[PDB]
Amino acid sequence: QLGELAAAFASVPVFPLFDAAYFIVSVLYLKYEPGAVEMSRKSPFASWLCAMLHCFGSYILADLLLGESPIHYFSNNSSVILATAVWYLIFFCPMNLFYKCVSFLPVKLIFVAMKEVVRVRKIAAGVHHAHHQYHHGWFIMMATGWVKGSGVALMSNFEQLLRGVWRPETNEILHMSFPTKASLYGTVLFTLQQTHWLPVSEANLVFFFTMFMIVCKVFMTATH
Amino acid sequence: QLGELAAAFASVPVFPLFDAAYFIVSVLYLKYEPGAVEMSRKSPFASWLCAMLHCFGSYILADLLLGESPIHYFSNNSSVILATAVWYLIFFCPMNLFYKCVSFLPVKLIFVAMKEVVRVRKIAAGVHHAHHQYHHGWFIMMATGWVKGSGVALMSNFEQLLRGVWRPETNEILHMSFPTKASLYGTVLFTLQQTHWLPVSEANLVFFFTMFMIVCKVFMTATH
Amino acid sequence: QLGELAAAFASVPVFPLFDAAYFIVSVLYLKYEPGAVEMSRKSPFASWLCAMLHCFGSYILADLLLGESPIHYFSNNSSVILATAVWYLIFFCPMNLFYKCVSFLPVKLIFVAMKEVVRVRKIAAGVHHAHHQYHHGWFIMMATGWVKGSGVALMSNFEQLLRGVWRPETNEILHMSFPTKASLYGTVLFTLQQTHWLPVSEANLVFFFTMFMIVCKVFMTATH
Ligand SMILES: CC/C=C/C/C=C/C/C=C/CCCC(=O)O[C@H](CO)COC(=O)CCCCCCCCCCC
Ligand SMILES: CC/C=C/C/C=C/C/C=C/CCCC(=O)O[C@H](CO)COC(=O)CCCCCCCCCCC
Ligand SMILES: CC/C=C/C/C=C/C/C=C/CCCC(=O)O[C@H](CO)COC(=O)CCCCCCCCCCC
Ligand SMILES: [Ca+2]
Ligand SMILES: [Cl-]
Ligand SMILES: [Cl-]
Ligand SMILES: [Cl-]
Ligand SMILES: [Cl-]
Ligand SMILES: [Cl-]
Ligand SMILES: [Cl-]
Ligand SMILES: [Cl-]
Ligand SMILES: [Cl-]
Ligand SMILES: [Cl-]
Ligand SMILES: [Cl-]
Ligand SMILES: [Cl-]
Ligand SMILES: [Cl-]
Ligand SMILES: [Cl-]
Ligand SMILES: [Cl-]
Ligand SMILES: [Cl-]
């Protein structure tokens, strides 16, 4: 009956709870970046735009690769407003209280695990969406699933440029972080499953690769 | 009968006279930039391309945001040729005579006011065009109207790169100039009017916001 | 009977032999770039992506200009695999044997001539493709044919960024190399032929402009 459990796991509604966890973890990472708090004070619109890149950079990149509107996902008003509320609470909540609650390690590890549920679903969705437009476009499927999983990391040089920072000596392709490299392995697996060369159901692959990402990220977050 | 006057004001044909004023003011600003005259001598094609960015950057950015051809507007041959003639006269007219005439302060203030007529129309057109593709895409409407009004300013980091200049410490989002910030207020107003939450006719909003931009820009130009 | 010879010349199948020559010459140029060999060792995925830019940058740029998927051409699996095999053999063949064979000057000059056959065909195809979407879009036709011929050179600032290099003081528009400038003359000629203002058959223009590019590039390669 594992396939019955895997089907329920792979079809949980990500909105709003799992998307909120994705936004919280991503905007927390933004606040850790150098000068981010000062930027929220002096350039609040640019700070909000930076948070939108961290929350929706996966869709911006995937739409750019497929020749669609790069801000197509911003028509989802409820998601944009939810990410905006997360950005406001993390940077401007009185007593910094919202930051204190979501940074509490037991709470943070749960949000970290929930973000990985969202990331794997976005990888698989990118492969399936590219396949719909290119039935045999294996390289387009792998590219779309990769940027859906890596997100803002692949545009880090220009997220820095928006913040007034320029560090051209490195980038996430020249030196992949773990989530970028893991998203590359994930998009190859989901493409192979789309090819019907990997004999596994799409629900089981989602379940087992999500558990791999959850264990890795929770372990990495709890260590440091 | 103000609405009858506002309807005539909001429907004046911008081509060719008001577009010419837009091109003249924008290419004048290009000639003020460092190394622009030297660039016209040594790299005339790059200088012409820079002037096309200043004249049509609003359409390039709006088409990029909506997933359309970024050079779609360059199919308008008469507009491209008119902007090309303006670029040639400003940089290469014998005796620098065309520059001397359009820089004469009474003449320049008139062209500055006429450019603001074009800018407000482009903001409203961007909101209406985005609304046609996304009936409830408020964030897409505001983004499209903003870049239609700000124009080349939002791509200033890469207009500089074309000229061989790189200044990453600042950008027009991190530090908005007045026209960029005013275009942001304008696109919010025209979006609200599109929402039917701002109880005002589209013609009256065009008239009153254009007069606001005309008074501000004419005052700013005459002061410095 | 020259038109009968020109028709056969202009319709030779570029895949796979002429495309292979295009890939070999382009990836050879990549290996000449500073730090390219070290990059293939330490960042092999970024090295492979760099080679894809050199092999398919013409299609990436043309699709970007026309608002299509910038990786649309990567649905051609056989072409991507052939370019991938060329990249692997040039950087990783035991004894560096493949590099030694294709760098042998008589063999290299033949591949250089065959690449020019591909470049002229891509210029003409870009003009014809833009004309199909814009019957009177002369500036869109010239832009599309130019990037189809220049290829990765027009994105050199960002091919360098992928390699961790940033040299903003120059670019291929501000200072055109010979292939970039020759592709600009070529796209004007093919646009004029599309206008029916240049009284010459498309096959004869392909033949005579290819011979011009072959003689120039073979002479330039044999000199240095
Ligand atoms: C301001 C925000 C802009 C950010 C630009 C960041 C771009 C980084 C994205 C890289 C995706 C490459 C996919 C890949 O590297 O992996 C796939 C699977 O292995 C294969 O690569 C290919 O298909 C060949 C891909 C050729 C490069 C595509 C360039 C598209 C230009 C978009 C810019 C408008
Ligand atoms: C070489 C020329 C290139 C120039 C690139 C310049 C880009 C600057 C444009 C910014 C428009 C943001 C709209 C905005 O900031 O304001 C709106 C309204 O408030 C909300 O922002 C969003 O919808 C979220 C917008 C998310 C960013 C969109 C990135 C698109 C990538 C285009 C590059 C191909
Ligand atoms: C990461 C890879 C990105 C690389 C970006 C490189 C861009 C260089 C391409 C230049 C083509 C200009 C065509 C031209 O200069 O020549 C033609 C014929 O004379 C006329 O120019 C116009 O039509 C006006 C063209 C206005 C500029 C178009 C900007 C498009 C933005 C694309 C970025 C997403
Ligand atoms: Ca498109
Ligand atoms: Cl940083
Ligand atoms: Cl601000
Ligand atoms: Cl998704
Ligand atoms: Cl997707
Ligand atoms: Cl098919
Ligand atoms: Cl400057
Ligand atoms: Cl030039
Ligand atoms: Cl408009
Ligand atoms: Cl518009
Ligand atoms: Cl609808
Ligand atoms: Cl270099
Ligand atoms: Cl690698
Ligand atoms: Cl082609
Ligand atoms: Cl083409
Ligand atoms: Cl037509």
* Number of C-beta neighbours around residue B188 at 10 A: 17
| CA proximity to C216, closest of C119, C99, C83, C101 | C119
| Ligand 15 center from residue C34 Cα (angstroms) | 6
Does the C-beta of A46 come closer than 6 Å to ligand 2?
no
Query: Residue A74 gets which letter from DSSP?
Result: G
- Interatomic CA distance for residues A86 and C221, integer angstroms: 59
The amino acid that residue C13 corresponds to is P
- Interatomic CA distance for residues A186 and A182, integer angstroms: 6
Q: What is the sign, positive or negative, of the torsion defined by CA atoms of C121, C55, C143, C140?
A: positive
Q: Which site among C136, C173, C188 would you substitute to test the B interface, given the most B Cβ atoms closer than 10 Å to its Cβ?
A: C173
| CA proximity to A20, closest of A128, A136, A124, A101 | A101
| CA proximity to B10, closest of B172, B191, B222, B201 | B201
Q: Domain-by-domain residue ranges, chain A?
A: 1-224
CA-based nearest residue in chain C for residue A176:
C43
CB A209 within 8 A of CB A186: yes
- Interatomic CA distance for residues B53 and B18, integer angstroms: 18
CB B58 within 8 A of CB B122: yes
The residue to mutate among B146, B180, B184, having the most atoms of ligand 2 within 8 angstroms of its beta carbon, is B146
Q: How many CB pairs under 8 A join B and C?
A: 56
The residues, any chain, with a CB within 8 Å of residue C88's CB and separated by 6 or more, are none
The residue to mutate among C49, C61, C81, C87, having the most atoms of ligand 1 within 8 angstroms of its beta carbon, is C49
Residue A42 to chain B, least CA–CA distance (Å): 9
Chain C residue numbers with beta carbons less than 8 Å from the beta carbon of B74 are: 137, 139-140, 143
The residues, any chain, with a CB within 8 Å of residue B167's CB and separated by 6 or more, are B157, B160
| CA proximity to B43, closest of B163, B178, B147 | B163
* Number of C-beta neighbours around residue B108 at 10 A: 19
Q: If DSSP codes are grouped into helix, strand and coil, which group holds residue B129?
A: helix
| Nearest-atom index, ligand 2, CA of B187 | 18
The residues, any chain, with a CB within 8 Å of residue B211's CB and separated by 6 or more, are none
Q: Where are the beta strands (DSSP E) in chain A?
A: none
- Interatomic CA distance for residues B140 and A73, integer angstroms: 9
Tell me the DSSP string of C105-117: HHHHHHHHHHHHH
- Where do the H-state alpha helices sit in chain B? 2-9, 17-32, 36-42, 44-65, 77-92, 97-103, 105-133, 138-150, 156-162, 178-195, 202-223
- Interatomic CA distance for residues A159 and A162, integer angstroms: 5
- Interatomic CA distance for residues B71 and C164, integer angstroms: 29
CB C126 within 8 A of CB C63: no
Q: If DSSP codes are grouped into helix, strand and coil, which group holds residue A209?
A: helix
Q: Which residue reads 């073979």 in tokens?
A: C218
Could you tell me which chains touch chain C, where touching means 3 or more CB pairs under 8 A?
Answer: A, B
The residues, any chain, with a CB within 8 Å of residue C114's CB and separated by 6 or more, are C17, C18, C21, C22
The residues, any chain, with a CB within 8 Å of residue A87's CB and separated by 6 or more, are A23, A27, A47, A48, A51
Q: If DSSP codes are grouped into helix, strand and coil, which group holds residue A165?
A: coil
What count of residues does chain A have?
A: 224
- The tally of CA atoms less than 13 A away on the side-chain side of residue A60 is 21
* Number of C-beta neighbours around residue A208 at 10 A: 13
CB C120 within 8 A of CB C189: no
Mark yes or no for CB contact C43/A140 under 8 Å: no
| CA proximity to A132, closest of A144, A121, A122 | A144
Give the H or E element holding residue C91: helix C77-92
- Phi/psi at C135 (5° precision): -60, -30
- Interatomic CA distance for residues A55 and B139, integer angstroms: 15
Long-range interactions of B105-112: CB distance < 8 A, separation 24+: B105/B222, B108/B25, B108/B28, B108/B221, B109/B218, B109/B221, B109/B222, B110/B21, B111/B21, B111/B24, B111/B25, B112/B25, B112/B217, B112/B218, B112/B221
Phi-psi map region of B164: left, alpha, beta (phi>0 left; psi -120 to 50 alpha): left
Mark yes or no for CB contact A46/B174 under 8 Å: yes
Chain B residue numbers with beta carbons less than 8 Å from the beta carbon of A52 are: none
- Phi/psi at A75 (5° precision): -70, -15
The residues, any chain, with a CB within 8 Å of residue A42's CB and separated by 6 or more, are none
Residue C114 to chain A, least CA–CA distance (Å): 27
* Number of C-beta neighbours around residue C219 at 10 A: 11
Q: If DSSP codes are grouped into helix, strand and coil, which group holds residue A80?
A: helix
Could you tell me which chains touch chain B, where touching means 3 or more CB pairs under 8 A?
Answer: A, C
- Interatomic CA distance for residues B3 and C60, integer angstroms: 49
| CA proximity to A163, closest of B169, B178, C162 | B169
| CA proximity to B87, closest of B140, B128, B46 | B46
Method: X-ray
- Interatomic CA distance for residues A211 and B71, integer angstroms: 46
Pair of tokens at residue A2: 């594992």
| CA proximity to C194, closest of C120, C119, C142, C149 | C142
- The tally of CA atoms less than 13 A away on the side-chain side of residue C74 is 22
- Interatomic CA distance for residues C147 and C130, integer angstroms: 12
| Ligand 18 center from residue C128 Cα (angstroms) | 8
| Ligand 3 center from residue A81 Cα (angstroms) | 35
Does the C-beta of C155 come closer than 6 Å to ligand 3?
yes
- Interatomic CA distance for residues C121 and C145, integer angstroms: 10
Q: If DSSP codes are grouped into helix, strand and coil, which group holds residue B199?
A: coil
Tell me the DSSP string of B63-127: HHHTTS-TTGGGG-HHHHHHHHHHHHHHHH-GGGHHHHHHHSHHHHHHHHHHHHHHHHHHHHHHH
Q: What's the 3-state SS for C35-64?
A: CHHHHHHHCHHHHHHHHHHHHHHHHHHHHH
Does the C-beta of C84 come closer than 6 Å to ligand 1?
no
- Interatomic CA distance for residues C88 and C102, integer angstroms: 14
Q: What is the sign, positive or negative, of the torsion defined by CA atoms of A127, A131, A134, A137?
A: positive
Could you tell me which chains touch chain A, where touching means 3 or more CB pairs under 8 A?
Answer: B, C
| CA proximity to C55, closest of C13, C85, C11, C33 | C85
- Interatomic CA distance for residues A34 and A212, integer angstroms: 30
CB B89 within 8 A of CB B98: yes
The residues, any chain, with a CB within 8 Å of residue B94's CB and separated by 6 or more, are none
- Interatomic CA distance for residues A168 and A159, integer angstroms: 12
CB C39 within 8 A of CB C46: yes
The residue to mutate among A142, A144, A188, having the most atoms of ligand 1 within 8 angstroms of its beta carbon, is A142
Query: Residue C73 gets which letter from DSSP?
Result: G
Chain A residue numbers with beta carbons less than 8 Å from the beta carbon of B138 are: 77
Burial letters for C35-67: b for 16+ Cβ neighbours within 10 Å, e otherwise? ebeebbeebeebbebbbbbbbbbbbbbbbbbbb
Work out the angle at residue B165's Cα, subtended by the Cα atoms of residues B164 and B167, and round it to the nearest 5 degrees.
155
CB A76 within 8 A of CB A19: no
CB A174 within 8 A of CB C162: yes
Q: Which residue reads 């570029």 in tokens?
A: C14
Pair of tokens at residue C131: 């004309």
